[PDB]
């Protein structure tokens, strides 16, 4: 495994460099390649042969190599550059490739965005099976860090809550979802249920009324 920093960060419109440290028999052999992994998309080749840009890659991506250490430099950082970056190299054979540990790139300086929250009640089809799932969908927020609290009649629910980690959507912002798994009886019992989403100190709460659906 080629040694990369676990994560790096640069500001918008600025530049950042990702290093790739190896030995004399991989990086030192003199033919490093770089790949970009955006979740929900196939990997993308950026650089090959230390310095050559792959087809369709702009010149703000550039590679270099000094001895057993290679570097990927990304100038003019844009929001869509946030991704994982992997270096690679052959070793002892052109069919024995070794990938680096991978580097996650964060682009700082982007505009804050509050989450839009939609709370969905259980469907009739699910209630017929004596189950009831409330779905809280959170989207269009940056930075990608939210905390979700569920309430029943105003008091905090501490059981049967599952929440996804925030992930990228098409517009480079983050989305998340949270699930409250109840039985038919619980859903009919309480007077209301609420999804409370805190993002950067501020909170958005949506409430659902079992009686009025």
């Amino acid at each position: 495994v080629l040694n990369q920093p676990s994560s790096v960060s640069g500001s918008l419109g600025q530049r950042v460099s990702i290093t790739c440290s190896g030995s004399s028999s991989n990086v030192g052999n003199g033919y490093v390649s770089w790949y970009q992994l955006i979740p929900g998309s196939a990997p993308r080749t950026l650089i090959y042969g230390d310095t050559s840009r792959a087809s369709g890659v702009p010149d703000r991506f550039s590679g270099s190599r000094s001895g057993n250490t290679a570097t990927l430099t990304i100038s003019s950082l844009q929001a869509e550059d946030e991704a994982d970056y992997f270096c690679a190299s052959a070793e002892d054979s052109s069919s024995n490739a070794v990938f680096g540990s991978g580097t996650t790139l964060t682009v700082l300086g982007q505009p804050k965005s509050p989450p839009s929250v939609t709370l969905f009640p259980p469907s009739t089809e699910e209630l017929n099976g004596n189950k009831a799932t409330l779905v809280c969908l959170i989207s269009d927020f940056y930075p990608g860090s939210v905390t979700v609290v569920w309430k029943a009649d105003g008091s905090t629910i501490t059981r049967n809550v599952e929440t996804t980690r925030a992930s990228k959507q098409s517009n480079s912002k983050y989305a998340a979802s949270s699930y409250l798994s109840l039985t038919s009886s619980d859903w009919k019992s309480k007077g209301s249920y609420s999804c409370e989403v805190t993002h950067e100190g501020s909170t958005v709460t949506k409430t659902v009324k079992p009686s009025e659906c």
């Binding site: 003199g30 042969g49 992997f86 069919s95 990938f99 469907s123 779905v135 699930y179």
Partner: protein, 271 residues
Amino acid sequence: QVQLRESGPSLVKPSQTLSLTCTASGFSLSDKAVGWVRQAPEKALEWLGSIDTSGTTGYNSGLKSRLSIIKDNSKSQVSLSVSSVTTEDSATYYCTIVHQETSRRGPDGYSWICECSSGTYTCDADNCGNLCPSDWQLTLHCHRLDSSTYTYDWHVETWGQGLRVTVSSASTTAPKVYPLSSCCGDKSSSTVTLGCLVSSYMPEPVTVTWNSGALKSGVHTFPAVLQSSGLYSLSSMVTVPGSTSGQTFTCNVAHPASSTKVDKAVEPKSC
């Protein structure tokens, strides 16, 4: 239109053989070398192996004894075999076109290769030339290249979309698809939001489209939650300008692991 389509089972039991196929189109396997790469969840990319135009296979040195790659030029298909899989072989498997060549790079600065009657030299100038005859010019401008010194060039030219494979002893579970609709009293829009809950399935992945793919913008499909039950759930949401009376909304869910496809009609809650 160079294409690489992986195919094979999305679920395999432990200690069995995982067998995948890659169908190439738009190019011939007699002209391009192809290889396999995988990425397990939360892990780095991992090279598996390749087979070149000559038909020579090459493997990850640490996995070769478990791997087998073979191709059929006439069918333009390449297969991968991983024996005695465990949960660590769960991953997305990518078919790829790889560049592979054996080169002879000398010290940095000596780019050109000069093989004379006196042997093989790496030289700094591109004339071969005034250097070959002279004994003094070679020791000046060239390094004598030893027989063993070889360098290797490898990179991925084209990536497939990848096929996710899960290694599990658990049985499959087809999803139950429930319509998502806000309560009555939230019908005041000005944009109406609805979706589908793809509940309790195993394994990943699941794909969701709306109106058979005719509804593109406004859609977002969230990643799945993994309940402690071992079953996955995810939601897909679409936001559309309201009112949208005179139009229907259908969420199309595909769970290839059980060859099941569900098209659930989502109707707004009329009160």
